[PDB]
Design a protein around this ligand. Structure first.
Ligand SMILES: [K+]
Ligand SMILES: [K+]
Ligand SMILES: [Mg+2]
Ligand SMILES: [Mg+2]
Ligand SMILES: [Mg+2]
Ligand SMILES: [Mg+2]
Ligand SMILES: [Mg+2]
Ligand SMILES: [Mg+2]
Ligand SMILES: [Mg+2]
Ligand SMILES: [Mg+2]
Ligand SMILES: [Mg+2]
Ligand SMILES: [Mg+2]
Ligand SMILES: [Mg+2]
Ligand SMILES: [Mg+2]
Ligand SMILES: [Mg+2]
Ligand SMILES: [Mg+2]
Ligand SMILES: [Mg+2]
Ligand SMILES: [Mg+2]
Ligand SMILES: [Mg+2]
Ligand SMILES: [Mg+2]
Ligand SMILES: [Mg+2]
Ligand SMILES: [Mg+2]
Ligand SMILES: [Mg+2]
Ligand SMILES: [Mg+2]
Ligand SMILES: [Mg+2]
Ligand SMILES: [Mg+2]
Ligand SMILES: [Zn+2]
Lengths: 125, 98, 127, 80, 24, 60, 155
RNA sequence: CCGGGCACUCUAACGGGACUGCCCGCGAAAGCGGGAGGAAGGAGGGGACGACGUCUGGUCAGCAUGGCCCUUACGGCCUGGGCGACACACGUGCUACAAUGCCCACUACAAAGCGAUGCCACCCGGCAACGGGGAGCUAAUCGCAAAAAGGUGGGCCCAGUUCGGAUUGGGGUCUGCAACCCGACCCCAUGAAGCCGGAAUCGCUAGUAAUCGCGGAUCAGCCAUGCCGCGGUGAAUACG
């Protein structure tokens, strides 16, 4: 049942199904199914309109999600970026932004390796 | 009815100290609770043998603290005399409460 | 009236008090099966009795402390083994050959320096 | 996931040296070594020279950066 | 796994406590 | 152990933090024990002399 | 083993069938010393072979093993700048070893999600003369024999 | 729990115990194979201990030391920065890729250690980290402390998935004069690579390997998944 912006979870327990939304996680999912009183274990396919409507209502009118989230987050990074800010720099240069080592590792933010040439003299290990 | 503590680094410095007491006050006070051996608390120090690098050698040193009790009931008059001031062991320390 | 033993395994001791009865076994105030809740090993513990056709002529009250369940299982095995000979030395003759009367000496070997754990040695490269 | 608690720290070195420079209008430059100090409202509009370890760097502090630290604007290392 | 701080093992491994592993 | 740096003893730390230990025998700052105020080297040395009461060679 | 010839560890008879060969199979199933978890798996499987089959699990077991033992295998060797697959008879002790190992190995290749089922099926499936465990056993024998030309290198 | 009692368990000092002594077989002997009694059997298991010497090995940055060299500076003090850079390469590890598994409950079973301006019971507040109050211990007596793997029940149903937790956005809590460079921790959101790894290569012979958690030193705090120890469950294999 499309809840958050064009979000259709189905054929799975509503709590996890709810997870397929940008802004919802085990935590919040477990919440809405409480403050809306809905056996979380029921399948989305076995939900009830009364329930499917309450869910939409609560979740949508209670949190900033999907497109909005992505937008705000985007805005934020652009922010510390526009201003001088160090983190901005790291976001610019595309390097880790939480005081991590960039000598080794840091692959997640650098992507694949861009190998080069070097010095194979003596135990370079 | 006195409760005495006997701690130390030498286990013979305390045996020649708990008995230094019991036998004495064993003829002027209750038959005493005999010397009770409290478990020991060991302190380990592990050091890299050499001054520079070689972090795989190491030598082990421990400073074990032994303990005793004794505990004589009936804080008699003729007891605090065979004892009181007739100490001998020097590596021992003594606590008293009753 | 009563018959004692002890039994120790991998640093776990157990009080084994045998008494003529059915086959009831109290371990720390619980039924044998209540304590050894689904641990296929359990059976073993009482093996010394079955060895001498006992079990169906005895009862046992067991106290245990130290170590772990399977280590306790063995302590009990030795306690019960000793208590049985405490009731009758003639039990050795055929109880001994099955070992039951021997204390398992193997214990956690010490952790040496330079190793990762007693024997596992650190991994070395381009040697 | 940033956090101090209660007491938005600021070396009074410049604070009582800026909150004062407000009285007689503004000013032109305030070189500091305390990049530890948190930037705050009454700094907006000013220009603080922060020592990066070799030099003091000009920093026109603006509304959009009222909560950040001063060092955050004086990059320490020089890369490629 | 032990790297998931939002799980039991996560907390235990990191030797911490919290929602996902409160002190009894 | 530069003499100038063994000024650590100088209570006046200005900020309690900055205060650190040092070997009371060699000045060594890098691996000083609390219960001895001695670094691992000096410690090993005196222990061998027998000048560290109760301290023995642990084996097990 | 350069000095002696290492005596074989004698195992403790099965807790249920009082069989030593069972403890072995259990051990091989076991990983990370979870002997409990191991034992159960085998047993549940025993009860699974007990259902889908009318024959006794213990006997089904024995058979499979017997069917997966290799009586011949090729052991590689060096001879004047060349390596040769030398067919060699297979030691009884090693047969039991390879058999039990293979069953478990093959078993965990199966598709059935539940461990015990995989052991269950593989085991019975084995006594039937089929199953990947038996195929390995056959490929090995096919390997040997197929190099009988290098058999004079007795080893 | 109380009275009560040291039997038991322990705690820790001192002793007893094994000698190839006994029997058989083989030797010329030393010994070898085997059998009994024994907790233990032929160095019972682990440790400390590493000869004359070799590598002009390592360390003048622990310290000591001959000689050189600087002695408003090659000495000394601060504030800030750096030791934490990154196209890239290797070592050692950690966490994984899942169903012999992951999650949430409920319930068991250790050993070593550490703690008076330090462990911190219990109570209240907070989702929580942690705050506020507060009993107890100079600690076999109080606290750290939950044991986890297990066992029981329930959920997930083979999916990059309730696998995995990288990265990033928020909001907080602590220590500290101060966490931008450059702290750990909590909560919400994010949810990366990864489907078992080419050539090549490491460890281990049994309470070992493999797995599971626990403590300590350093230390305000911590970048420890490192070291040094502790105990639970517990294999495979050795023809040669
Ligand atoms: K030399
Ligand atoms: K990645
Ligand atoms: Mg989501
Ligand atoms: Mg960095
Ligand atoms: Mg080291
Ligand atoms: Mg272990
Ligand atoms: Mg190392
Ligand atoms: Mg997870
Ligand atoms: Mg000097
Ligand atoms: Mg410090
Ligand atoms: Mg220091
Ligand atoms: Mg040289
Ligand atoms: Mg060299
Ligand atoms: Mg010199
Ligand atoms: Mg460095
Ligand atoms: Mg570069
Ligand atoms: Mg690591
Ligand atoms: Mg609360
Ligand atoms: Mg910092
Ligand atoms: Mg992929
Ligand atoms: Mg998969
Ligand atoms: Mg060996
Ligand atoms: Mg630890
Ligand atoms: Mg610390
Ligand atoms: Mg770090
Ligand atoms: Mg740690
Ligand atoms: Zn020193």
């Amino acid at each position: 049942a499309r809840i958050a912006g064009v979000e259709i979870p189905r054929n799975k327990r509503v709590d996890v199904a709810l997870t397929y939304i940008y802004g919802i996680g085990k935590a919040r999912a477990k919440e809405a199914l409480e403050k809306t009183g809905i056996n979380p274990a029921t399948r989305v396919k076995d939900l009830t309109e009364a329930e499917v409507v309450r869910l939409r209502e609560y979740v949508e009118n209670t949190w900033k999600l999907e497109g909005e989230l992505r937008a705000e987050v985007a805005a934020n990074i652009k922010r510390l970026m526009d201003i001088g800010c160090y983190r901005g720099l790291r976001h610019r240069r595309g390097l880790p932004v939480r005081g991590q080592r960039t000598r080794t590792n840091a692959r997640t933010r650098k992507g694949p390796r861009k190998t080069v040439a070097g010095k194979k003299k003596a135990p370079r290990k | 009815k006195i409760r005495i503590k006997l701690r130390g680094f030498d286990h013979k410095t305390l045996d020649a100290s708990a008995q230094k007491i019991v036998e004495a006050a064993r003829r002027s006070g209750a038959q005493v609770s005999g010397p009770i051996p409290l478990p020991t608390r060991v302190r380990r120090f592990t050091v890299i043998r050499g001054p520079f690098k070689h972090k795989d050698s190491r030598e082990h040193f421990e400073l074990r603290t032994h303990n005793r009790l004794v505990d004589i009931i009936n804080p008699n008059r003729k007891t605090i005399e065979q004892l009181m001031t007739l100490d001998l062991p020097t590596g021992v320390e003594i606590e008293i409460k009753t | 009236e009563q018959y004692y033993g002890t039994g120790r395994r991998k640093e776990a001791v157990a009080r084994v008090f045998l008494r003529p009865g059915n086959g009831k076994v109290t371990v720390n105030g619980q039924d044998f099966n209540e304590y050894f809740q689904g641990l296929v090993r359990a059976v073993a513990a009482l093996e010394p009795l079955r060895a001498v056709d006992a079990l169906g002529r005895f009862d046992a009250y067991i106290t245990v402390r130290g170590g772990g369940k399977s280590g306790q299982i063995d302590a009990i095995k030795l306690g019960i083994a000793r208590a049985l000979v405490q009731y009758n030395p003639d039990y050795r003759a055929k109880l001994k050959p099955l070992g039951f009367l021997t204390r398992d000496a193997r214990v956690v070997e010490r952790k040496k320096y330079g190793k990762h754990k007693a024997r596992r040695a650190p991994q070395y490269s381009k040697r | 996931p940033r956090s101090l608690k209660k007491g938005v720290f600021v070396d009074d070195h410049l604070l009582e040296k800026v909150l004062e420079l407000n009285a007689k209008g503004e000013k032109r430059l305030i070189k500091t070594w305390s990049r530890r100090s948190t930037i705050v409202p009454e700094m907006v509009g000013h220009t603080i020279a922060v020592y990066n370890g070799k030099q003091h760097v000009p920093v026109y502090i603006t509304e959009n950066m009222v909560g950040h630290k001063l060092g955050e604007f004086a990059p320490t290392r020089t890369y490629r | 796994g032990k790297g998931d701080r939002r799980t039991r093992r996560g907390k235990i491994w990191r030797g911490t406590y919290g929602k996902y592993r409160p002190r009894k | 152990a530069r003499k100038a740096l063994i000024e650590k003893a100088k209570r006046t730390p200005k900020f309690k933090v900055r205060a650190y230990t040092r070997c009371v025998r060699c000045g060594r700052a890098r691996s000083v024990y609390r219960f001895f105020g001695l670094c691992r080297i000096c410690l090993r040395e005196l222990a061998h002399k027998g000048q560290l009461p109760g301290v023995r060679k642990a084996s097990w | 083993a350069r000095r002696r010839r290492a005596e074989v560890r004698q195992l403790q008879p099965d807790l249920v069938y009082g069989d030593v060969l069972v403890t072995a199979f259990i051990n091989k199933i076991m990983r990370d010393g979870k002997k409990n978890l191991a034992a159960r798996i085998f047993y549940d499987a025993c009860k699974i072979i007990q259902e889908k089959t009318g024959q006794e699990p213990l006997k089904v077991f024995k058979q499979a093993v017997e069917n997966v033992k290799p009586r011949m295998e090729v052991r590689s060797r060096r001879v004047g700048g060349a390596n040769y697959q030398v067919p060699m008879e297979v030691s009884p002790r090693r047969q039991q070893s390879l058999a039990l190992r293979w069953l478990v190995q093959a078993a965990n290749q199966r598709p059935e999600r539940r461990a015990a089922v995989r052991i269950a099926h593989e085991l019975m499936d084995a006594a039937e003369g089929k199953g990947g465990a038996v195929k390995k056993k056959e490929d090995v024998e096919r390997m040997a024999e197929a190099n009988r030309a290098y058999a004079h290198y007795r080893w």
